[PDB]
Amino acid sequence: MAAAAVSSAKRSLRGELKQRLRAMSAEERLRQSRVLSQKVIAHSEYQKSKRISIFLSMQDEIETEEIIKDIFQRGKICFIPRYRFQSNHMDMVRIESPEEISLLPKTSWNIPQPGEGDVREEALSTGGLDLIFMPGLGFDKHGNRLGRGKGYYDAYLKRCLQHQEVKPYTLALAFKEQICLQVPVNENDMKVDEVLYE
Ligand SMILES: [Mg+2]
Ligand SMILES: [Mg+2]
Ligand SMILES: [Mg+2]
Ligand SMILES: [Mg+2]
Ligand SMILES: [Mg+2]
Ligand SMILES: [Mg+2]
Ligand SMILES: [Mg+2]
Ligand SMILES: [Mg+2]
Ligand SMILES: [Mg+2]
Ligand SMILES: [Mg+2]
Ligand SMILES: [Mg+2]
Ligand SMILES: [Mg+2]
Ligand code: NI
Ligand code: NI
Ligand code: NI
């Protein structure tokens, strides 16, 4: 019953967060995205990181395009999510340029990811990750994260705590609108090291 009461709060907050996000102008999204991009490029953990995981942005997410360009300009090794829609399973798969993203097939969420027969280098098979940019519907200032309900990123973060002597740095990119007072969590949810916004 306590488990269910947590899920209910998470579900209620998602709907509340999604309404706010849907109500944002396209040009305001692009604006905070530009503010976060510049903040990320200045960020010391980003500048030091050599192997990176970043997400490809949905319409209700901070746009990562300018970050991805910077990543490749600085010769960083770039990995992106490849979701296995059957379960809460994802890997991080290597892409070799920003332009490759444009030719990839898309999922039912209209997000690019290498297809089923496209054999990719997975981050955890070649040394893990220094830095993971974390998407999500909401974050609080304690680093608690509210995902979309599937727990892909919670599960993946636990996997990185195998393989890696030193865990990845986890950097969430959030609209000011996604910043919450209290994000409902259970013992299974994974905090992020830092939430960027403004
Ligand atoms: Mg690092
Ligand atoms: Mg956007
Ligand atoms: Mg699938
Ligand atoms: Mg992997
Ligand atoms: Mg390739
Ligand atoms: Mg496509
Ligand atoms: Mg996984
Ligand atoms: Mg709140
Ligand atoms: Mg979570
Ligand atoms: Mg937590
Ligand atoms: Mg923090
Ligand atoms: Mg701030
Ligand atoms: Ni897999
Ligand atoms: Ni190659
Ligand atoms: Ni608090």
Binding site members: 10-14, 56, 61, 145-154, 189
Q: Note the ligand closest to the C-alpha atom of 79.
A: 4
Q: Which helix (H) or strand (E) holds 47?
A: helix 44-48
Centre of ligand 3 from the C-alpha of residue 91, in Å: 11
Contact 53, 46 (CB under 8 A): no
Identify the CA nearest to 169 among candidates 148, 193, 185.
Answer: 193
Map out the domains of the chain as residue ranges: 1-198
CATH topology of domain 1-198: Rossmann fold (3.40.50)
Q: What is the chain's length?
A: 198
- Which of 150, 152, 157, 194 lies closest to 173 in space, CA to CA? 194
* Resolution of the experimental structure, in angstroms: 2.1
Are 93 and 79 in contact by the 8 Å Cβ rule? The answer is yes
Numbered residues of the known binding site for ATP: 10-14, 145-153
Q: How far is the CA of 104 from the centre of ligand 13 (A)?
A: 18
Give the technique used to solve this structure: X-ray
